[PDB]
Amino acid sequence: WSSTADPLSNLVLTFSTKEDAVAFAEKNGWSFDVEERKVPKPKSKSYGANFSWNKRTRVSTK
């Protein structure tokens, strides 16, 4: 079986905001690394671009 010696291997906390997590980590005396949230950037979708007259976006099959 998989054995462990640390008690914090399964401890995961949920926070509403980044500031709440940072404050909780600071008041508990834990050194922390913060990663900025990754958001998928908005994209331009056009069904009519599939059947293009002169561009490469024209599809060969559908």
Partner 1 sequence: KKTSFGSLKDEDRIFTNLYGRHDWRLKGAQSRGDWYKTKEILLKGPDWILGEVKTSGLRGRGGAGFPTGLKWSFMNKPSDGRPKYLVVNADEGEPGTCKDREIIRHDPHKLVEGCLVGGRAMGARAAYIYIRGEFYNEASNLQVAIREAYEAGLIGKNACGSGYDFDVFVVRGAGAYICGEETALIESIEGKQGKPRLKPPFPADVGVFGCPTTVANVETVAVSPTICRRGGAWFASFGRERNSGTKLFNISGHVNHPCTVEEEMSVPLKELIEKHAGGVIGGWDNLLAVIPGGSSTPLIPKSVCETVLMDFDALVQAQTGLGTAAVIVMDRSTDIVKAIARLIEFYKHESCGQCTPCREGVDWMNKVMARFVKGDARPAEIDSLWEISKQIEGHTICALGDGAAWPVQGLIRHFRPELEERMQQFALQHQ
Partner 2 sequence: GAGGALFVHRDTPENNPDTPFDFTPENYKRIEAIVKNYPEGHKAAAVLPVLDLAQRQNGWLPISAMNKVAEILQVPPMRVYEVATFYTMYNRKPVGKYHIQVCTTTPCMLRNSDSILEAIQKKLGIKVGETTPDKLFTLIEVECLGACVNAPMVQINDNYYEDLTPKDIEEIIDELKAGKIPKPGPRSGRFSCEPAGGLTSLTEPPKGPGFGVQAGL
Partner 3 sequence: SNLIEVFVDGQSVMVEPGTTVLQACEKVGMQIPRFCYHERLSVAGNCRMCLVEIEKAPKVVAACAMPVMKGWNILTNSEKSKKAREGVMEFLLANHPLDCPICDQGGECDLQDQSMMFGSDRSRFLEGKRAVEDKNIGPLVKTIMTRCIQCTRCIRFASEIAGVDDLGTTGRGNDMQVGTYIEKMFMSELSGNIIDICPVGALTSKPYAFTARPWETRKTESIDVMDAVG
Q: Is 20 within 8 Å of 26 (Cβ atoms)?
A: no
Please tell me the distance from the alpha carbon of residue 22 to that of residue 32, in angstroms, as a whole number.
Answer: 8
Exactly one of 8, 35, 54, 56 binds partner 1 (CB under 8 A); that residue is 54
What residue 8 binds from partner 3, partner 2, partner 1, none (CB within 5 to 8 A, per partner kind)?
Answer: none
Q: Does 60 bind partner 1 (CB under 8 A)?
A: yes
- Residues 42-53: b if buried by 16+ CB within 10 A, e if exposed: eeeeeeeeeeee
Q: Does 49 bind partner 3 (CB under 8 A)?
A: yes
Q: Tell me which residues touch partner 3 (CB under 8 A).
A: 40, 42-47, 49-50, 57, 59-62
